[PDB]
From TrEMBL, chain A:
Alphabetically ordered keywords of this record: ATP-binding, NAD, Nucleotide-binding, Nucleotidyltransferase, Pyridine nucleotide biosynthesis, Transferase
Record keyword Transferase present: yes
GO molecular function: ATP binding; nicotinate-nucleotide adenylyltransferase activity
Domain Cytidyltransferase-like intervals: 6-133
Gene3D superfamilies: HUPs
Catalytic reaction equation(s): nicotinate beta-D-ribonucleotide + ATP + H(+) = deamido-NAD(+) + diphosphate
Organism: Vibrio parahaemolyticus serotype O3:K6 (strain RIMD 2210633)
Protein known as: nicotinate-nucleotide adenylyltransferase
Family listed: Belongs to the NadD family.
Enzyme class: transferase
GO BP field: NAD+ biosynthetic process
Pathways involved: Cofactor biosynthesis; NAD(+) biosynthesis; deamido-NAD(+) from nicotinate D-ribonucleotide: step 1/1
From TrEMBL, chain B:
Pathway: Cofactor biosynthesis; NAD(+) biosynthesis; deamido-NAD(+) from nicotinate D-ribonucleotide: step 1/1
Species annotation: Vibrio parahaemolyticus serotype O3:K6 (strain RIMD 2210633)
EC primary class: transferase
Domain of life: Bacteria
Function: Catalyzes the reversible adenylation of nicotinate mononucleotide (NaMN) to nicotinic acid adenine dinucleotide (NaAD).
InterPro entries per record: Cyt_trans-like, NadD/NMNAT, Rossmann-like_a/b/a_fold
GO biological process terms on file: NAD+ biosynthetic process
Protein name stated in the entry: nicotinate-nucleotide adenylyltransferase
Presence of the UniProt keyword Glycoprotein in the record: no
GO MF annotations, alphabetized: ATP binding; nicotinate-nucleotide adenylyltransferase activity
Keyword annotations of the record: ATP-binding, NAD, Nucleotide-binding, Nucleotidyltransferase, Pyridine nucleotide biosynthesis, Transferase
Recorded catalytic activity of this chain's protein: nicotinate beta-D-ribonucleotide + ATP + H(+) = deamido-NAD(+) + diphosphate
Gene3D superfamilies found in the cross-reference section: HUPs (3.40.50.620)
Length: 155, 163
């Protein structure tokens, strides 16, 4: 791996919103989906695994760096992935909202000395709260996420 | 081709700081350097950028002059680039200083709706301009052919337009 992108999110649940970001990253050697430590962590991990299967994109894997680090800061996460892959160049994938407020992040300056920070457009716009509310309300969520994820959510 | 990164800068003059950003973009199919419009005249900056590209020896980098053609906000520039390469995915590249000032860009939010924005780390131009005016060594600030052109034409120290 030379170019590694790491995309942290609640993935609560993974949605077509996340997919619209992740599918833009085909030029990276490895794209790591790191679920943050309401759906509990083990279920979110299973949902992310289903999501990855559904997307069928060769460069995407789930990462669990927060598990050994466990609050877990972006800095700590990037430091850890850099230690695992010393020869790689690391890119942190962020939402635009956080991109605009990055100066407030713990060790923001230090991050910008070491690593790339990338905001990808959210071409599909879906709030997690809206999906989880749809589940409670009993409405169809098949167009909100990928098929295996939706099957797992209903169960 | 499919992944195109655009890096705008004054390139006034191109430095090892610019190189540190551009060399991180090997994963893009094409990287376009767009010089913007103590400011050296645009055609001279273009000449420096051409030498800089040759010096870096990175096969995916080209100079682009679409700003000259539009004579220009980032928003307008990206719209034009998307027009020229309609099937490409475009990423706009900035360094840390513009990164923390990005909200101030014209239609910054609309940019993020349409295109990827990437802030690359500075691992390594105003220091060069200062060293040239004072006769100090610049060989550690820029690439060899750029240094040659800066000195030979008396850029900054004696002229800004070469006229
Ligand atoms: Cl989420
Ligand atoms: Cl500059």
């Amino acid at each position: 791996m030379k170019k590694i992108a790491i995309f942290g999110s609640a993935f609560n649940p993974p949605s077509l919103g996340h997919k619209s970001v992740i599918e833009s990253l085909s030029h990276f050697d490895l794209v790591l989906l790191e679920p943050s430590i309401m759906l509990d962590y083990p279920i979110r991990c299973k949902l992310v695994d289903a999501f990855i299967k559904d997307m069928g994109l060769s460069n995407v894997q789930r990462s669990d760096l927060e598990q050994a680090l466990y609050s877990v800061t972006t800095y700590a996460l990037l430091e850890k992935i850099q230690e695992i892959y010393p020869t790689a160049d690391i890119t942190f994938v962020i939402g635009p909202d956080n991109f605009f407020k990055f100066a407030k992040f713990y060790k923001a300056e230090e991050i910008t000395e070491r690593w790339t920070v990338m905001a990808c457009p959210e071409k599909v716009k879906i709030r997690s709260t809206d999906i989880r509310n749809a589940l409670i309300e009993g409405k169809d969520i098949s167009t909100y996420t990928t098929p295996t994820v939706s099957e797992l959510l209903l169960n």
